[PDB]
Ligand binder design. Structure first.
Ligand SMILES: [Zn+2]
Ligand SMILES: [Zn+2]
Ligand SMILES: [Zn+2]
Ligand SMILES: [Zn+2]
Lengths: 81, 81
DNA sequence: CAACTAGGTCACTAGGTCAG
DNA sequence: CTGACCTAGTGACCTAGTTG
């Protein structure tokens, strides 16, 4: 049913204010718990991301996350209303 | 003067819990803190932390301080009208 | 009795692991 | 570095019990 609004994979829950997979989620937290910048992207930084190529572009995977809406200020603990 | 506010995180108030207008969240969070030996792991950003809807869950320490600081207490319960 | 609230549950999910 | 799996919490919903 519901699939990750980042790489299209099956969503594991409502994470960071967005319906995402365990992969993007984990990667996402990992990304902000360290403002550390991933290397730049070789191909005009518009690397379309999918279940298959997500791990290819870190700097775009990350932006995508930001782009879709994933934040610390968007966490919805609890039960689905 | 409707839609009273949880006097801790400003979130909406579901009622008058433990002596003060609170939200299910902070409400549950309180009876949970006292009804246990629960001793939260020390604060990180200079015991002060702002508590609001978005961040309330980040520093457990301050949150509890905040509750106690607004009046929440087991002895001030009002089952009235 | 009717407008309320403690308490209890249990559906959800950050965060932390650690084996590929 | 990534992502499957757990666990300690979080808070939306209910209901037993308490007042006016
Ligand atoms: Zn994903
Ligand atoms: Zn890119
Ligand atoms: Zn609150
Ligand atoms: Zn704090």
């Amino acid at each position: 049913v519901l699939l990750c609004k980042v790489c299209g994979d099956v969503a594991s829950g409502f994470h960071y204010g967005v319906l995402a997979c365990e992969g993007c989620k984990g990667f996402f937290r990992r990304s902000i718990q360290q403002n550390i910048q991933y290397k730049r992207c070789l191909k005009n930084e518009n690397c379309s991301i999918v279940r298959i190529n997500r791990n290819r572009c870190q700097q775009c995977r990350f932006k995508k996350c930001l782009s879709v809406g994933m934040s610390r200020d968007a966490v919805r603990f609890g039960r689905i209303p």
